[PDB]
Amino acid sequence: XVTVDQDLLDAAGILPFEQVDIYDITNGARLTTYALPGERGSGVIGINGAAAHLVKPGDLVILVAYGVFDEEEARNLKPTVVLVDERNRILEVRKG
Amino acid sequence: XVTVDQDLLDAAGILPFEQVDIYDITNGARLTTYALPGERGSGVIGINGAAAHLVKPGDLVILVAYGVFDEEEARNLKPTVVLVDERNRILEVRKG
């Protein structure tokens, strides 16, 4: 895979090549793939590969990244949530 | 599972027995299994077991391996991509 505007990756704190899950709000699909850096500022969210069977252009989705934490760090984690508009421009970022 | 020409595993840097995901370009299936070393140079991509219900002979697929990285290593990772022909012979290998 999924090409993502790198601006979004930066805001999310998701690295290129990191595994991500895609949960489709439009149709309910759920899958696992990875992120690829996309043109900055383009707002690109491109589904490459087999995933195209499940996630279509125009779909609303949620891209989630999970990490492996130690107990202490887990308890102090404040996840990052990036909210975007219909063009995938950042509206707000929440933490925790 | 999935028997893979070991030449391909070597090029990919995927170890025998390593967990891999299979994403089916032909039909959209997505599953998790593991790699088994196959005859070198045969170009074998054999679906063994339950997976046969989802992935059929002739299907185009993507075999993906995910690892667990430390922050530093994650940021410097250059994934390996093996491109093959219709017989599963290597055409090119990309990194990063």
Binding site: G46, A52, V61, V64, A65, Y66, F69, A74, V82, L83 | -
Partner: peptide, 24 residues
């Protein structure tokens, strides 16, 4: 024990394109 935690997400993004036969 190590825990698997959600650490980040892009919420309610819109898919802009698709390429089933992408090569890369």
């Amino acid at each position: 024990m190590k825990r698997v935690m959600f650490h980040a997400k892009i919420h309610r993004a819109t898919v802009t394109q698709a390429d089933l036969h992408y090569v890369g």
